[PDB]
């Protein structure tokens, strides 16, 4: 199970689209 979640886990004004990535990670991981 540790192996599984390791495989899952792989100026800020410019980097708010990265936060979409974060929501998508929470979107993708928990789905």
């Amino acid at each position: 199970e540790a192996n599984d979640n390791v495989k899952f886990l792989k100026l800020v004004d410019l980097f708010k689209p990265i936060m979409h990535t974060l929501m998508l990670i929470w979107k993708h991981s928990k789905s």
């Binding site: 495989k7 792989k10 979409h20 990535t21 998508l24 993708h28």
Partner: peptide, 17 residues
């Protein structure tokens, strides 16, 4: 006085299947 980012991140999550 960002559609392609969505699709590509879906692609990378599917690479980690």
């Amino acid at each position: 006085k960002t559609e392609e980012q969505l699709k590509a991140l879906e692609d990378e999550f599917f690479k980690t299947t």
